[PDB]
Amino acid sequence: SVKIGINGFGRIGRLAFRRILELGSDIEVVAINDLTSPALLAHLLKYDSTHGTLNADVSATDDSIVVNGKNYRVYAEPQAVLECTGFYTSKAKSQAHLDAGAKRVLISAPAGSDLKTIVYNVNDDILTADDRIVSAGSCTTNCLAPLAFFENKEFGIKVGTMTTIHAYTSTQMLLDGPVRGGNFRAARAAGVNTIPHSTGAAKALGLVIPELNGKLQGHAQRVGVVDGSLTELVAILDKKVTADEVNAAIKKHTEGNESFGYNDDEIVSSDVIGTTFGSIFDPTQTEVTSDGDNQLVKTVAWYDNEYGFTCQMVRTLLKFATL
Amino acid sequence: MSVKIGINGFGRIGRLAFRRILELGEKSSDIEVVAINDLTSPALLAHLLKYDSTHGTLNADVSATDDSIVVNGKNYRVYAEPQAQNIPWVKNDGVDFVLECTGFYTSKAKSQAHLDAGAKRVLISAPAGSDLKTIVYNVNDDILTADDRIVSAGSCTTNCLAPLAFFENKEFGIKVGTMTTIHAYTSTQMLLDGPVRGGNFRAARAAGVNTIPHSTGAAKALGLVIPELNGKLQGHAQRVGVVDGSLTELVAILDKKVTADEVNAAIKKHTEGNESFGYNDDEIVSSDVIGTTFGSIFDPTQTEVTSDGDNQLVKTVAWYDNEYGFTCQMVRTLLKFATL
Amino acid sequence: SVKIGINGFGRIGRLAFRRILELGEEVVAINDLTSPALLAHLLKYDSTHGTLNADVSATDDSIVVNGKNYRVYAEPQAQNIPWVKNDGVDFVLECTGFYTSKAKSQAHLDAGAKRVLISAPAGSDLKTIVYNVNDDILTADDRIVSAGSCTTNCLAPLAFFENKEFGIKVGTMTTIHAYTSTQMLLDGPVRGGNFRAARAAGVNTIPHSTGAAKALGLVIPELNGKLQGHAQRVGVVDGSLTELVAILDKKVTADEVNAAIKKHTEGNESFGYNDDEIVSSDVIGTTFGSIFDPTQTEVTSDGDNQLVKTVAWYDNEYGFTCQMVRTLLKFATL
Amino acid sequence: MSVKIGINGFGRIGRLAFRRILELGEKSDIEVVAINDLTSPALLAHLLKYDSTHGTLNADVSATDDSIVVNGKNYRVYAEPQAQNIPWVKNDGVDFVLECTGFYTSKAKSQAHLDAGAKRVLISAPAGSDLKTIVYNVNDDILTADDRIVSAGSCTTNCLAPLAFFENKEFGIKVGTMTTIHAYTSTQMLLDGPVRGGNFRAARAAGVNTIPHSTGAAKALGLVIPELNGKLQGHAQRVGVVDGSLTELVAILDKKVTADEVNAAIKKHTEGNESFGYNDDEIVSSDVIGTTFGSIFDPTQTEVTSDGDNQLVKTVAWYDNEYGFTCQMVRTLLKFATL
Ligand SMILES: NC(=O)c1ccc[n+]([C@@H]2O[C@H](COP(=O)([O-])OP(=O)(O)OC[C@H]3O[C@@H](n4cnc5c(N)ncnc54)[C@H](O)[C@@H]3O)[C@@H](O)[C@H]2O)c1
Ligand SMILES: NC(=O)c1ccc[n+]([C@@H]2O[C@H](COP(=O)([O-])OP(=O)(O)OC[C@H]3O[C@@H](n4cnc5c(N)ncnc54)[C@H](O)[C@@H]3O)[C@@H](O)[C@H]2O)c1
Ligand SMILES: NC(=O)c1ccc[n+]([C@@H]2O[C@H](COP(=O)([O-])OP(=O)(O)OC[C@H]3O[C@@H](n4cnc5c(N)ncnc54)[C@H](O)[C@@H]3O)[C@@H](O)[C@H]2O)c1
Ligand SMILES: NC(=O)c1ccc[n+]([C@@H]2O[C@H](COP(=O)([O-])OP(=O)(O)OC[C@H]3O[C@@H](n4cnc5c(N)ncnc54)[C@H](O)[C@@H]3O)[C@@H](O)[C@H]2O)c1
């Protein structure tokens, strides 16, 4: 066994728990830390308003959660591993887990440029046994990276810009009000607004695909759904192309690809909730705009920003064993 | 001669109280807001005052400085002092009276901190225990005196239920009754499922995509406002997926046998000219009450009498803008209280 | 096997299909107003109940599931659907909302169908069955039967057992109900012209008339005349709850009422039990017609005047559908 | 001496047009004198008075069996399915028709109004290429006295047009693509089900999905701005709000620019512009509900991405897809009076 401590039993920690359980394949969790009663953590694991009720026996004791007759010890220690709090988002900060005997830490978020950022099935081949603190990137990184990686190999991305139409998340407010950081848009009611939101996924995409350093920028629009997101990429490419050419080329790279999938059934956001891909290419939205020989190419991939990302993070976790 | 107000907590209720006082113009000239305390930048407080996802954009010139917000050229000093006893607004700004709207000072002992800071009087924007007076304007505001120092404006649900229950009891006699309020979500709830202050299993759940049962004390505690109904009511809420606008259903055993039209006529007469307890028979829905100025809006279209022989239940319903309708009630009480 | 024609592949007809399919150890044809391509698509991808774990496609005239073919028609008049000669239809599961009577569902009989089970209230001149309350009143003689409404299937076992244990003198219901297809996304004119049905469903709490309490005597004769109620339609896509407030014959406490109702949920696939402080999402996809929630029980007393509030959750779509499939199974094998 | 308007189709757009013209009437100058719609006046009056998006009208509204009454004034409601039979020119003094039914969306169809004696018709939608498509404050100067049937374009056209027009004037757009992140509309479904046209996305529940949707506003923009014919494409993502939308434009420009340069250049065209506004307060979609612009430039989202010689520029404008479009149409009705 490699024994996992999940720090932060939030949307991503609980979902990582669910994924590792359902892989029952042999990876296993053995303990958890949050700011919360074991009772409420077990209740949250069992009942999920996005992902439905866990088909397992779930209960709590005074210091643990219990699932299917196994005990998982729980702590309430605010100062510190699958690091999922959002409070240890750097190598400097994620220092305590090393500082008490982990071989490694995988942070569930971007965590700077002085460590490696991994998108499974794009660049997980750079991991070495020396790698102790590793970023699994953002949810948007795991969706955008394979699209841009394959689109670039095929056609040469000169420059690109991204807009993700993204589900609301726990950083946002239910109703308008003061918000940590003071941001004017973070402050606003998430369920009844389209809310522009800054993202680093395009700008920092060089950490995953070095040759795309400096070549992409983007942002998000946070919209009134609980989960399920889509990334639009508009690029100037080296090659002149048509939409059918683009689709056929990208599609090839989805074949058997558990990280970067494909759907041509004219799906909508709900349909990706509970999917296991980091990114789902949608050829039905591909558009090539041309006049003379000046050309814009729009491509799109969907993603369960919660569970798709979580599945990517678990794959990267499982790969730590091979090192 | 104006009583100078310090608003503690420039949240949904504190900002709307500001909007209400402003729009009242000369009708609110007995008071004057001079200072605001919260946990944030003046820049964000001004921005939240100006742009409101529920109630729309304020038709006023709003800006911020490094220590104040400015509205139509009037300056309102801003503090960010989490401990109320340390807010220096009595000395610095002349504050006489604190409008307490944080949610964190809802008791006599807690709001003592404002008196320790030098305030003369405090009106709390919530229930705040039984050792102080709880006022629903136009039901029991007559119990206020010049000697009160810390008073509760009650809850949103109290301000909706009270006049309905008051007048229904006066006309017919409520023997026992139960309430269900179908209530907009509020800022105590969660956007997505997760740990929540208090550890409550339902309060932890995503508010925009669930009907969520929620405890309320308005019915059980209604004797604080209407002594004769002490012990006669209980109830609860269902928090539902709208930002604002709520309704209270009351099911009662009455001392009189009735029809819906009889109950409607008898209650309606108490809404006539009543700025606190209104009446709407247009078959409205929740969003229609957003921005209204009543604590309670009786809806005769939902009255139901259920009988089999001499066994009877009677269901009555009143809408409320839990934000602005309550706020308007609290400002009425504020105007009365401040000037005793 | 008895061969089912599903008329109306809407929310309920598609879910009936999914339920029949998941049950494993049935359906031969389908009618609607639309292409086989779109019906296949809607059976596969569902915004409420998720993606069907089956291989689904469409031919020019039929849907395909796990290599099995189901014929599709687009015939507005039930009389005119040729599924009895073409497909062997012996039994119509009537799910359109437009044949909601014995008079109207007669058209299936004229089309050659042996029986009809209507997925809705359908008058008082036929039987209305809530499975595990009154399904013993079915016989071989019956041809057109009502599976009730979604609200009837929630309210009925709750009222039934409460009445059996305590005696209901009178009661009123409020169901806090998911929006449905009869409502609008934005405000505008609606069929029937009702001022509330006209209003945007996702951003309002909307009072709505219901007949389930008033008509409950069709299911539970001794409660004829003793119940009324209504709905509040709220901004969720599925998942509902029914509150009942009643005057009882017996004096009670909440713990007493909870224990007495709970015993009738033991092993009961129609009327279940949940005391984990659930919320509406949690019942989406559940297979009960009704889920008693003892956490919401309340007994209000002053002197000898007493009111009792009890509540049951329901997946108004799938819970109802599972009820209907139970009744189908019984009704078709008689 | 007032311009008198007949509204054909008292839907969301017709009702908002009534509300706009009422409020201008408070006191430049235009009044509604009659309506044609097949719904009962009682329901129409109810929907004029209460609205889940735009709030309650601050007026006394009631109904008779053939009219709506507002503030003591009677507004006849005709119920003619064929527009050539609406009698409101000789009965009510109708000068111009605002055609908002969705069923007269062509020059040849709306001829019916002219046959009933209307001087001019404005259609509340795209209506083909054999009549003029006018975005007020972009190309309304092309109207002449001979223009009797005119299209307002779409709501999207009214947002995109001024952004594209001014951006092209300042910098030259070589090619561009649009994504509008758009509030759900009446054509969509509350819950998944069969849908007119059979489209797989149109079929889906609108309140709980982000739904891709085809648009024509970018492709057809040459009708408004001829030099952009053939240069733009785009689509929409329909999202879970009742109203309030934004249009993103990504373009290759003739000039090398910075973000600040782009912002300043576009900003100067918003100044005093009642049709194409400006907001740099970091607003969100609800903040535009009830605003009167067809388009609201938001410099906070401008982005310029550049690697060596290749450059992309993203610019964004917000819009009340209902009321901003409505206010554009009323501007064009007022312009009709000067022809
Ligand atoms: N939600 C998504 O779609 C998504 C996708 C990818 C990555 N992420 C990232 O994952 C992280 C968590 O996101 P989430 O959506 O799960 O948020 P969340 O709020 O659901 O989870 C955070 C959890 O951490 C706990 N916590 C907070 N401070 C803590 C501390 N000092 N010690 C221990 N526990 C603490 C909280 O109580 C909470 O349960 C963030 O870094 C986020 O950016 C989120
Ligand atoms: N929202 C409603 O419908 C409603 C109706 C009636 C009463 N109330 C009551 O009014 C109060 C506030 O509710 P709300 O909805 O406005 O909440 P809110 O969260 O919008 O506002 C709370 C405000 O108080 C501030 N705050 C918190 N702690 C503070 C401290 N120590 N010092 C200074 N400021 C602090 C917050 O930053 C926030 O701006 C609560 O007691 C609530 O029960 C609310
Ligand atoms: N949604 C629920 O929660 C629910 C629960 C229980 C019962 N019901 C009842 O079941 C019935 C259907 O409800 P729904 O929610 O599935 O509605 P729906 O709108 O989803 O389904 C109706 C289907 O019937 C089709 N249809 C309409 N007219 C037709 C005709 N003449 N011939 C063939 N097909 C036709 C429509 O195209 C649509 O696909 C109603 O009677 C309703 O009261 C609904
Ligand atoms: N809904 C929007 O926000 C929106 C936005 C931009 C453009 N539009 C366009 O405006 C028009 C309608 O949109 P809406 O949202 O106001 O429509 P709606 O569906 O809200 O109302 C349409 C109205 O037309 C009436 N009608 C139908 N046939 C008629 C006939 N033969 N004669 C007279 N009246 C008739 C109906 O009785 C109804 O009241 C269309 O051209 C549409 O594309 C709508």
Side-chain angles (χ1 to χ4, degrees), chain C residues 1-7 13 16-17 20 26-31 70-71 83-84 87-95 113 115-117 324-325 328-329 332:
Chain C
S1 78
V2 180
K3 307 287 110 80
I4 300 97
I6 297 169
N7 195 32
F17 189 107
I20 293 163
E26 305 188 321
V27 184
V28 106
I30 300 163
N31 185 60
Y70 308 86
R71 180 95 159 73
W83 50 12
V84 310
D87 316 288
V89 161
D90 57 48
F91 200 114
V92 179
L93 179 70
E94 172 42 61
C95 312
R115 309 177 162 152
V116 182
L117 180 62
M324 189 180 54
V325 171
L328 226 194
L329 288 165

CSV table of all heavy atoms in Angstrom, one decimal, chain C residues 1-7 13 16-17 20 26-31 70-71 83-84 87-95 113 115-117 324-325 328-329 332:
chain,number,residue,atom,x,y,z
C,1,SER,N,-44.3,-12.7,-23.3
C,1,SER,CA,-44.3,-11.2,-22.9
C,1,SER,C,-45.4,-10.4,-23.5
C,1,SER,O,-45.8,-10.6,-24.6
C,1,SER,CB,-42.9,-10.6,-23.2
C,1,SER,OG,-42.8,-10.2,-24.6
C,2,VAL,N,-45.9,-9.5,-22.7
C,2,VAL,CA,-46.9,-8.6,-23.1
C,2,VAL,C,-46.2,-7.4,-23.7
C,2,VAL,O,-45.2,-6.9,-23.1
C,2,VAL,CB,-47.8,-8.2,-21.9
C,2,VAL,CG1,-48.9,-7.2,-22.2
C,2,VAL,CG2,-48.3,-9.5,-21.3
C,3,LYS,N,-46.6,-7.0,-24.9
C,3,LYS,CA,-45.9,-6.0,-25.8
C,3,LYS,C,-46.5,-4.7,-25.5
C,3,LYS,O,-47.7,-4.5,-25.7
C,3,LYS,CB,-46.2,-6.4,-27.3
C,3,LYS,CG,-45.9,-7.8,-27.7
C,3,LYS,CD,-44.5,-8.1,-27.7
C,3,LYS,CE,-43.9,-8.9,-26.6
C,3,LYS,NZ,-44.2,-10.4,-26.9
C,4,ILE,N,-45.6,-3.7,-25.1
C,4,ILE,CA,-46.1,-2.4,-24.7
C,4,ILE,C,-45.8,-1.4,-25.8
C,4,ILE,O,-44.7,-1.4,-26.4
C,4,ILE,CB,-45.4,-1.9,-23.4
C,4,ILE,CG1,-45.7,-2.9,-22.3
C,4,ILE,CG2,-45.8,-0.5,-23.0
C,4,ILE,CD1,-44.7,-4.0,-22.1
C,5,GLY,N,-46.8,-0.5,-26.1
C,5,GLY,CA,-46.6,0.6,-27.0
C,5,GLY,C,-46.6,1.8,-26.0
C,5,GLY,O,-47.5,1.9,-25.2
C,6,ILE,N,-45.5,2.6,-26.1
C,6,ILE,CA,-45.5,3.8,-25.2
C,6,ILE,C,-45.9,5.0,-26.1
C,6,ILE,O,-45.3,5.3,-27.1
C,6,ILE,CB,-44.0,4.1,-24.7
C,6,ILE,CG1,-43.5,3.0,-23.7
C,6,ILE,CG2,-44.0,5.4,-23.9
C,6,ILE,CD1,-42.1,3.0,-23.3
C,7,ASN,N,-47.0,5.7,-25.7
C,7,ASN,CA,-47.5,6.9,-26.4
C,7,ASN,C,-47.1,8.1,-25.5
C,7,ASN,O,-47.5,8.2,-24.3
C,7,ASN,CB,-49.0,6.9,-26.6
C,7,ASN,CG,-49.5,7.9,-27.6
C,7,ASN,OD1,-48.8,8.3,-28.6
C,7,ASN,ND2,-50.7,8.5,-27.4
C,13,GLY,N,-42.5,8.8,-20.3
C,13,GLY,CA,-42.3,7.7,-21.2
C,13,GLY,C,-40.9,7.2,-21.4
C,13,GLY,O,-40.6,6.0,-21.4
C,16,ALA,N,-39.8,5.5,-18.1
C,16,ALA,CA,-40.5,4.2,-18.1
C,16,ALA,C,-39.7,3.2,-18.9
C,16,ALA,O,-39.4,2.1,-18.4
C,16,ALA,CB,-41.9,4.2,-18.6
C,17,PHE,N,-39.2,3.7,-20.0
C,17,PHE,CA,-38.3,2.8,-20.8
C,17,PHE,C,-37.1,2.4,-20.1
C,17,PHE,O,-36.7,1.2,-20.0
C,17,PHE,CB,-38.0,3.6,-22.2
C,17,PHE,CG,-37.3,2.7,-23.2
C,17,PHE,CD1,-37.9,2.2,-24.3
C,17,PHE,CD2,-35.9,2.4,-23.0
C,17,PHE,CE1,-37.3,1.4,-25.2
C,17,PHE,CE2,-35.3,1.6,-23.9
C,17,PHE,CZ,-36.0,1.1,-24.9
C,20,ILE,N,-37.8,-0.1,-17.2
C,20,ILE,CA,-38.1,-1.5,-17.8
C,20,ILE,C,-36.8,-2.1,-18.2
C,20,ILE,O,-36.5,-3.2,-17.8
C,20,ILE,CB,-39.2,-1.4,-18.9
C,20,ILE,CG1,-40.5,-1.0,-18.3
C,20,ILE,CG2,-39.3,-2.7,-19.7
C,20,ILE,CD1,-41.5,-0.5,-19.2
C,26,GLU,N,-42.6,-6.5,-22.3
C,26,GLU,CA,-41.8,-5.3,-22.5
C,26,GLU,C,-41.9,-4.5,-23.9
C,26,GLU,O,-42.7,-4.8,-24.7
C,26,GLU,CB,-40.3,-5.7,-22.2
C,26,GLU,CG,-40.2,-6.2,-20.8
C,26,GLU,CD,-38.7,-6.4,-20.4
C,26,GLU,OE1,-38.0,-6.8,-21.4
C,26,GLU,OE2,-38.3,-6.1,-19.3
C,27,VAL,N,-41.0,-3.5,-24.1
C,27,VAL,CA,-41.4,-2.5,-25.0
C,27,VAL,C,-41.1,-2.9,-26.4
C,27,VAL,O,-40.1,-3.4,-26.7
C,27,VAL,CB,-40.7,-1.1,-24.6
C,27,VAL,CG1,-41.2,0.0,-25.5
C,27,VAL,CG2,-40.9,-0.8,-23.1
C,28,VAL,N,-42.1,-2.6,-27.3
C,28,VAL,CA,-41.9,-3.0,-28.7
C,28,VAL,C,-42.1,-1.7,-29.6
C,28,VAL,O,-41.5,-1.6,-30.7
C,28,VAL,CB,-42.9,-4.1,-28.9
C,28,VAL,CG1,-44.1,-3.6,-29.7
C,28,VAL,CG2,-42.2,-5.4,-29.3
C,29,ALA,N,-42.8,-0.8,-29.2
C,29,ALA,CA,-43.0,0.4,-30.0
C,29,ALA,C,-43.3,1.7,-29.3
C,29,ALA,O,-43.7,1.6,-28.1
C,29,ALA,CB,-44.0,0.2,-31.1
C,30,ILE,N,-43.1,2.8,-30.0
C,30,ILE,CA,-43.2,4.1,-29.4
C,30,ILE,C,-43.8,5.2,-30.3
C,30,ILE,O,-43.5,5.3,-31.5
C,30,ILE,CB,-41.8,4.6,-29.1
C,30,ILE,CG1,-41.1,3.7,-28.1
C,30,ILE,CG2,-41.8,6.1,-28.6
C,30,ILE,CD1,-39.6,3.9,-28.1
C,31,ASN,N,-44.6,6.1,-29.8
C,31,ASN,CA,-45.2,7.1,-30.6
C,31,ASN,C,-45.0,8.5,-30.0
C,31,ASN,O,-45.1,8.7,-28.8
C,31,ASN,CB,-46.7,6.9,-30.7
C,31,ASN,CG,-47.4,7.9,-31.6
C,31,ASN,OD1,-47.1,8.0,-32.8
C,31,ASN,ND2,-48.3,8.6,-31.1
C,70,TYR,N,-36.5,-0.6,-31.6
C,70,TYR,CA,-37.8,-0.1,-31.1
C,70,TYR,C,-38.5,0.8,-32.1
C,70,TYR,O,-38.1,2.0,-32.3
C,70,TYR,CB,-37.7,0.5,-29.7
C,70,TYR,CG,-37.0,-0.4,-28.7
C,70,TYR,CD1,-35.6,-0.5,-28.6
C,70,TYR,CD2,-37.8,-1.3,-27.8
C,70,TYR,CE1,-35.0,-1.3,-27.7
C,70,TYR,CE2,-37.1,-2.2,-27.0
C,70,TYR,CZ,-35.8,-2.2,-26.9
C,70,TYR,OH,-35.1,-3.0,-25.9
C,71,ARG,N,-39.6,0.4,-32.7
C,71,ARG,CA,-40.2,1.2,-33.7
C,71,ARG,C,-40.8,2.5,-33.2
C,71,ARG,O,-41.4,2.5,-32.2
C,71,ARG,CB,-41.3,0.4,-34.4
C,71,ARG,CG,-42.1,1.1,-35.5
C,71,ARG,CD,-41.4,0.7,-36.8
C,71,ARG,NE,-42.3,0.9,-38.0
C,71,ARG,CZ,-42.6,2.1,-38.5
C,71,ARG,NH1,-42.2,3.2,-37.9
C,71,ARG,NH2,-43.3,2.1,-39.6
C,83,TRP,N,-49.5,0.4,-34.6
C,83,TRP,CA,-48.6,-0.5,-33.8
C,83,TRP,C,-49.1,-1.9,-33.4
C,83,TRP,O,-48.4,-2.7,-32.9
C,83,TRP,CB,-47.9,0.2,-32.6
C,83,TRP,CG,-48.9,1.0,-31.7
C,83,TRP,CD1,-50.2,0.9,-31.7
C,83,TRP,CD2,-48.5,1.9,-30.7
C,83,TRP,NE1,-50.7,1.8,-30.6
C,83,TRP,CE2,-49.6,2.4,-30.0
C,83,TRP,CE3,-47.2,2.3,-30.2
C,83,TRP,CZ2,-49.6,3.3,-29.0
C,83,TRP,CZ3,-47.2,3.3,-29.2
C,83,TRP,CH2,-48.3,3.7,-28.6
C,84,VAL,N,-50.5,-2.0,-33.5
C,84,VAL,CA,-51.0,-3.3,-33.2
C,84,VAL,C,-50.6,-4.3,-34.3
C,84,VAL,O,-49.9,-5.3,-34.0
C,84,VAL,CB,-52.4,-3.4,-32.6
C,84,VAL,CG1,-52.6,-2.4,-31.5
C,84,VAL,CG2,-53.4,-3.3,-33.7
C,87,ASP,N,-46.4,-4.0,-34.9
C,87,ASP,CA,-45.5,-4.4,-33.8
C,87,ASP,C,-45.9,-5.3,-32.7
C,87,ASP,O,-45.1,-5.8,-31.9
C,87,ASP,CB,-45.0,-3.0,-33.2
C,87,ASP,CG,-44.7,-2.0,-34.3
C,87,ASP,OD1,-43.7,-2.3,-35.0
C,87,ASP,OD2,-45.4,-1.1,-34.6
C,88,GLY,N,-47.2,-5.7,-32.7
C,88,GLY,CA,-47.7,-6.7,-31.7
C,88,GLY,C,-48.1,-6.0,-30.4
C,88,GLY,O,-48.2,-6.6,-29.4
C,89,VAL,N,-48.4,-4.7,-30.5
C,89,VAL,CA,-48.8,-3.9,-29.3
C,89,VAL,C,-50.0,-4.5,-28.7
C,89,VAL,O,-51.0,-4.7,-29.4
C,89,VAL,CB,-49.0,-2.4,-29.6
C,89,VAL,CG1,-49.7,-1.5,-28.6
C,89,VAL,CG2,-47.6,-1.8,-29.8
C,90,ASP,N,-49.8,-5.0,-27.5
C,90,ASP,CA,-51.0,-5.5,-26.7
C,90,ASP,C,-51.5,-4.5,-25.6
C,90,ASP,O,-52.7,-4.5,-25.2
C,90,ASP,CB,-51.0,-7.0,-26.4
C,90,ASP,CG,-49.8,-7.4,-25.7
C,90,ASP,OD1,-49.6,-6.8,-24.7
C,90,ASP,OD2,-49.2,-8.5,-26.0
C,91,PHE,N,-50.7,-3.5,-25.2
C,91,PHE,CA,-50.8,-2.7,-24.0
C,91,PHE,C,-50.2,-1.4,-24.2
C,91,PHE,O,-49.1,-1.3,-24.6
C,91,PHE,CB,-50.0,-3.5,-22.9
C,91,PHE,CG,-50.4,-3.1,-21.6
C,91,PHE,CD1,-50.9,-4.1,-20.7
C,91,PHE,CD2,-50.2,-1.8,-21.1
C,91,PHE,CE1,-51.3,-3.8,-19.5
C,91,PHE,CE2,-50.6,-1.5,-19.8
C,91,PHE,CZ,-51.1,-2.5,-19.0
C,92,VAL,N,-51.0,-0.3,-24.0
C,92,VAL,CA,-50.5,1.1,-24.2
C,92,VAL,C,-50.2,1.7,-22.8
C,92,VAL,O,-51.0,1.7,-22.0
C,92,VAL,CB,-51.4,1.9,-25.0
C,92,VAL,CG1,-50.9,3.3,-25.2
C,92,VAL,CG2,-51.7,1.3,-26.4
C,93,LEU,N,-48.9,2.2,-22.7
C,93,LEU,CA,-48.6,3.0,-21.5
C,93,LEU,C,-48.8,4.4,-22.0
C,93,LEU,O,-48.0,4.9,-22.8
C,93,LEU,CB,-47.2,2.7,-21.1
C,93,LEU,CG,-46.7,3.5,-19.9
C,93,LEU,CD1,-47.5,3.0,-18.6
C,93,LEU,CD2,-45.2,3.4,-19.6
C,94,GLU,N,-49.9,5.0,-21.6
C,94,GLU,CA,-50.3,6.3,-22.1
C,94,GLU,C,-49.7,7.5,-21.4
C,94,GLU,O,-50.2,7.8,-20.3
C,94,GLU,CB,-51.9,6.4,-22.2
C,94,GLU,CG,-52.5,7.7,-22.5
C,94,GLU,CD,-51.8,8.5,-23.7
C,94,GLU,OE1,-51.8,8.0,-24.8
C,94,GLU,OE2,-51.4,9.7,-23.5
C,95,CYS,N,-48.7,8.2,-22.0
C,95,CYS,CA,-47.9,9.2,-21.3
C,95,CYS,C,-47.8,10.6,-22.0
C,95,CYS,O,-46.9,11.4,-21.7
C,95,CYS,CB,-46.5,8.7,-21.1
C,95,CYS,SG,-46.3,7.0,-20.4
C,113,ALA,N,-55.7,-2.0,-29.2
C,113,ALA,CA,-55.0,-2.3,-27.9
C,113,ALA,C,-55.9,-3.0,-27.0
C,113,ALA,O,-57.1,-2.6,-26.9
C,113,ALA,CB,-54.5,-1.0,-27.3
C,115,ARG,N,-55.3,-3.2,-23.4
C,115,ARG,CA,-55.4,-2.4,-22.2
C,115,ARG,C,-54.6,-1.1,-22.3
C,115,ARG,O,-53.7,-0.9,-23.1
C,115,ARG,CB,-54.8,-3.2,-21.0
C,115,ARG,CG,-55.4,-4.5,-20.8
C,115,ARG,CD,-54.8,-5.3,-19.7
C,115,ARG,NE,-55.7,-6.4,-19.4
C,115,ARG,CZ,-55.4,-7.6,-18.8
C,115,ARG,NH1,-54.2,-8.0,-18.5
C,115,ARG,NH2,-56.4,-8.5,-18.6
C,116,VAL,N,-54.9,-0.1,-21.4
C,116,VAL,CA,-54.2,1.1,-21.3
C,116,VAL,C,-54.0,1.4,-19.8
C,116,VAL,O,-54.8,1.2,-19.0
C,116,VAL,CB,-55.1,2.2,-21.9
C,116,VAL,CG1,-54.3,3.6,-21.8
C,116,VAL,CG2,-55.5,1.9,-23.3
C,117,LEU,N,-52.7,1.9,-19.6
C,117,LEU,CA,-52.4,2.4,-18.2
C,117,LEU,C,-52.0,3.9,-18.5
C,117,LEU,O,-51.1,4.1,-19.2
C,117,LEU,CB,-51.3,1.7,-17.5
C,117,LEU,CG,-50.9,2.1,-16.1
C,117,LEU,CD1,-52.1,2.0,-15.1
C,117,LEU,CD2,-49.7,1.4,-15.7
C,324,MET,N,-45.5,3.3,-11.5
C,324,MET,CA,-46.3,3.0,-12.6
C,324,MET,C,-45.8,1.7,-13.3
C,324,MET,O,-46.7,0.9,-13.7
C,324,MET,CB,-46.2,4.2,-13.6
C,324,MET,CG,-47.1,4.1,-14.8
C,324,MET,SD,-47.0,5.5,-15.9
C,324,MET,CE,-45.2,5.5,-16.3
C,325,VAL,N,-44.5,1.4,-13.2
C,325,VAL,CA,-44.0,0.2,-13.8
C,325,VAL,C,-44.4,-1.0,-12.9
C,325,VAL,O,-44.8,-2.1,-13.4
C,325,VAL,CB,-42.5,0.3,-14.0
C,325,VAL,CG1,-41.9,-1.1,-14.3
C,325,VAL,CG2,-42.2,1.2,-15.1
C,328,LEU,N,-48.0,-1.5,-13.8
C,328,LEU,CA,-47.9,-2.1,-15.2
C,328,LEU,C,-47.6,-3.6,-15.1
C,328,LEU,O,-48.4,-4.4,-15.7
C,328,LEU,CB,-46.7,-1.5,-16.0
C,328,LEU,CG,-46.9,-1.0,-17.4
C,328,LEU,CD1,-45.5,-0.8,-18.0
C,328,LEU,CD2,-47.7,-2.0,-18.2
C,329,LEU,N,-46.6,-4.0,-14.4
C,329,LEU,CA,-46.2,-5.3,-14.3
C,329,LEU,C,-47.4,-6.2,-13.8
C,329,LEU,O,-47.7,-7.2,-14.4
C,329,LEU,CB,-45.0,-5.6,-13.4
C,329,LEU,CG,-43.7,-5.2,-14.1
C,329,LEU,CD1,-42.6,-5.1,-13.0
C,329,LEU,CD2,-43.2,-6.0,-15.2
C,332,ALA,N,-50.6,-5.9,-16.5
C,332,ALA,CA,-50.4,-6.7,-17.7
C,332,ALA,C,-50.3,-8.2,-17.5
C,332,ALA,O,-50.6,-8.9,-18.5
C,332,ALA,CB,-49.1,-6.2,-18.4
